[PDB]
Structure 1
Amino acid sequence: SKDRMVELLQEHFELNLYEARAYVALVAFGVLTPAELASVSEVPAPRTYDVLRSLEKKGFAMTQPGKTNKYRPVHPANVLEKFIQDWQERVKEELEAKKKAKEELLELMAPLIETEVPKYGVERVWVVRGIKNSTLKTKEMLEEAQNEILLADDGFIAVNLEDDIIKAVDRGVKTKILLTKNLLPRLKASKIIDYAKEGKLELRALDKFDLPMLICDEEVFFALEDLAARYFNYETQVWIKDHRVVALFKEKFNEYWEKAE
């Protein structure tokens, strides 16, 4: 039918509905004026000029300017052939455009991938309040740690996060536990001291240290103090996930750590 001709033109040769209808009409009727097209095909009267003019510019028609414009269809074997050839040239050009878009993006995104160290998630600073949230944060750090754990403990930490601490030790995590000497005998029946003696974790003590902390693989979790927080009672703590901050707290742990035993 003629319907199939309209579809094919619309689908593959970039004509809109009216343009496809008008071109088919031109093939069938030869010379048409916009007025005649109106009566010949299914194209709105105010569009018949607009449409035929488009087909002209698209290479599907030729014309005779005048008070009344006459239009002539370009033979299908020419315009359909020409289109595919012109189409193929656009394609080939675009391919090059994409590979140059490719290279330019690679150049532009090298700055985003060059820093091969700090690839943490967005959330790197997290403020923790209260006892419940505190132990929940400490649990996670212990759950996620895979390389090392450094703990300076004046808590309220070894008890009862013991079962999380030992679990990490059981996973081969290089554990070091430093705690206040005054709090030492609290662990006299702990699992930690057994692992300390067997021993897969090292444990030491110190009369009192000023800056307690938990370090877990490029993460540090420490508490602010000012100055009756303990047993009065309220907690304010800060979590940071960044090698550079951890390096500071790790250097300090190692200063506290070398107070052997």
Structure 2
Amino acid sequence: SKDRMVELLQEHFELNLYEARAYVALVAFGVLTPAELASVSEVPAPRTYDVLRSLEKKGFAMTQPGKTNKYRPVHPANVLEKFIQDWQERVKEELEAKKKAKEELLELMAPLIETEVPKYGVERVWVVRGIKNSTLKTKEMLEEAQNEILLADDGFIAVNLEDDIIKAVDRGVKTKILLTKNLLPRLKASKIIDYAKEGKLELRALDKFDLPMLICDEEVFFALEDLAARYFNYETQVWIKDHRVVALFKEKFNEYWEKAEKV
């Protein structure tokens, strides 16, 4: 049926329902006026004028501009192919746009695209208070270290982490431990000194220092001194991830590293 003809035009030749029905009628009857198209098709009378005129622009029909516009269809063997030929031409240029767009994006993204692979955030600053939260974040730093692990503990750490440290040390992580001499007695049964005496890590001690810290690679962990709170194990501690800041702390640690007696 003609339904098939109409259906084919809409899908592959960019003609709408009315425009489709129109062209089919044109080929069928040869020459038609807007008024005639309404009687020999299903196209609404009021639309027959802009529909045929629309076809006039797309190149499907020819016209006689007058009081009574006459329209005749172009040979379907002609229009149907030029459409494809043009359609192939429009797709080619549309392709060119996609490639140039790709190159630009790959150019703009080059500086932005980085091997950053979190490790959740995105967050370079974290506030920890609880004893539970203090330990969990402490383990993450050690169990994720890759280059160096620097520790300056004066008893602000809630729990001993010998195993968490050794777990990293055995992973090929260079480690430096600095402790207050009022902590050494607590390390007699702990077998970290073994790694120290065996030279698997460096362990020194100092009488006192007012800037405890835990440096793990680009991350650093310290507390906002409030001795009243530390006793209640609710002291506020801050985690910061930045090479500029850590680079600064590393200098202080090196400062503390000296003047320290080897255990």
TM-score (norm 1): 0.88
| Structure with higher helix content | 1
Q: Distance in 2 between matches of 1:103 and 1:119?
A: 30
Counterpart in the other structure of 2:199: 199
Q: How does 1:1-261 map to 2 (within 5 A)?
A: 1-113=1-113, 122-157=122-157, 159-261=159-261
**What's the CA shift string for 1:49-102, capped at 9, x where partnerless?**
222221111111112233443221111111112112222222333333334334
Contact map agreement 2:135 2:158 (CA 8 A) in 1: no
Work out the CA distance in 2 between the residues paired with 1:144 and 1:186. 26
Q: Separation in 1 of the partners of 2:136 and 2:199?
A: 27
Rate the CA distance shift 1:131–1:42 in 2: closer, same or farther, 3 A: same
SS in structure 2 opposite 1:179? strand
Task: Tell me if structure 1 keeps the 8 A contact 2:60–2:73.
Answer: yes
Q: Comparing 102-111 with 83-92, which one deviates more in the overlay?
A: 102-111
Once superposed, what is the RMSD of the aligned Cα atoms? 2.8
Moved more, 113-122 or 90-99: 113-122
* CA spacing shift, 1:164–1:7, aligned 2, 3 Å: same
| TM-score (norm: length of structure 2) | 0.88
Query: In the TM superposition, what whole-angstrom CA distance separates every residue of 1:92-118 from its partner, at most 9, and x where no partner exists?
Result: 333333343344334433443599999
**Equivalents in 2 of 1:131, 1:118: separation in Å?**
24
C-alpha contact (below 8 Å) 2:131/2:233 kept by paired residues: no
Q: More deviation in 242-251 or 158-167?
A: 158-167
Instruction: Give the gaps of 5 or more residues in structure 1.
Output: none
User: Where does structure 1 differ by over 4 angstroms across 4 or more consecutive aligned residues?
Assistant: 113-121
* Counterpart-to-counterpart distance in 2, 1:48 and 1:201: 91
**Shift in alpha-carbon separation, 1:42–1:55, aligned structure 2, 3 A:** same
Deviations 1:217-261 (A, max 9, x none): 111111111352221452211111111111011111111112332
Q: Distance in 2 between matches of 1:76 and 1:119?
A: 63
Q: Secondary structure at the match of 2:66?
A: coil
- Alpha carbons of structure 1 residues 119 and 81: separation in structure 2 relative to 1, 3 Å: farther
Q: How far has the Cα of 1:193 moved from its partner?
A: 1.7
Provide the secondary structure at the position in 1 that maps to 2:38.
helix
Question: Are the aligned partners of 2:130 and 2:233 in contact in 1 as well (CA < 8 Å)?
Answer: no
Report the alpha carbon displacement of residue 22 of structure 1 after superposing the two structures with TM. 1.5
Question: What is the aligned-residue identity percentage?
Answer: 100
Q: How many residues align?
A: 261
Question: How far apart are the structure 2 equivalents of 1:257 and 1:120?
Answer: 32
Structure 2, gaps ≥5 residues long:
none
